């Protein structure tokens, strides 16, 4: 389960680092992203929650695999420049339960028909 990093760019104006991470697990299945995260954190002597492996696709027959990684200066910048879904995936943030777009669009369409403060009441 050797990890290697290439193409490293330090994004101070995004307070992180961007690389390409390659994991070698011949015979074994694809690496768990948590294990990749731990190995990258040990490599870069920084917190394991401030490292983001993503887009990890494996090659045929096991062995080689490639997926990108974002190592962040601080958790503030991590959950400052990032989409919510990644933070939900790794547990940093949480998913917000929201109605489907069909239902929400119907709600707003009916809310259009009604004027004043009854817009909130109608549902």
């Amino acid at each position: 389960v050797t990890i290697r990093t290439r193409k490293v760019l330090t994004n101070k104006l995004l307070y992180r680092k961007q690389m390409v991470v390659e994991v070698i697990h011949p015979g074994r299945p694809t690496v768990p992203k948590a294990d990749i995260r731990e190995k990258i954190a040990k490599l870069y002597k920084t917190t394991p929650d401030t490292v983001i492996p993503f887009g990890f696709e494996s090659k045929i027959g096991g062995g080689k695999s490639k997926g990108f990684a974002l190592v962040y200066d601080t958790i503030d910048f991590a959950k400052k420049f990032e989409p919510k879904y990644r933070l939900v995936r790794m547990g940093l943030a949480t998913k917000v339960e929201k109605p489907g777009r069909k239902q929400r669009k119907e709600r707003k369409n009916r809310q259009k028909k009604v004027r004043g403060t009854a817009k909130a009441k109608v549902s």
Partner: protein
């Protein structure tokens, strides 16, 4: 919105569907190099004919033409790196001498049984299909896969195959259990 995806054909059907000479010759070629269908050989014939027609179009021009130089050197280079054209034969006036057998020999399916990795060409094909061959640490399951000169010497058994080192096959596991 979305664009037109770019496609291109590689096989051109013969003008005469039936003639004993071509039929027998192509059957003999299929036998010599294990292929699946006549489209396989027409693909090689049409690649060869593209090569030859481009070379002829080039030779219609004189020797030191910039386009002639670039294209001829590139084409001789590609054929060399595949291992079809001879590396002491550097000219299009000589590339106008090739045959389908040359390209067909540069298929993985041939090299497998050639270098002793399989007994028959059929055995070679079924081994590649079952993922028991590897190339430069790369399990290629494509019999028509094209083996360059460099990769010519970089094929051995798969690092996971029971025959290349790994768990016993299904029959062996059944017997053990």
């Amino acid at each position: 919105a979305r664009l037109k995806t770019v496609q291109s054909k590689v096989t051109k059907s013969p003008r005469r569907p039936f003639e004993k000479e071509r039929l027998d010759q192509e059957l003999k070629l299929i036998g010599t190099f294990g292929l699946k269908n006549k489209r396989e050989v027409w693909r090689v014939k049409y690649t060869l004919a593209k090569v030859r027609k481009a070379a002829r179009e080039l030779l219609t021009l004189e020797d030191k033409d910039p386009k002639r130089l670039f294209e001829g050197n590139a084409l001789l280079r590609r054929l060399v790196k595949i291992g079809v054209l001879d590396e002491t034969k550097m000219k299009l006036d000589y590339v106008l001498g090739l045959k389908v057998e040359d390209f067909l020999e540069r298929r993985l399916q041939t090299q497998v049984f050639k270098l002793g990795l399989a007994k028959s060409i059929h055995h070679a094909r079924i081994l590649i299909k079952q993922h028991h061959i590897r190339v430069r640490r790369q399990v290629v399951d494509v019999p028509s896969f094209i083996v360059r000169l460099d990769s010519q010497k970089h094929i051995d058994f798969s690092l996971q195959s029971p025959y290349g080192g790994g768990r016993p096959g299904r029959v062996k596991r059944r017997t053990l259990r």
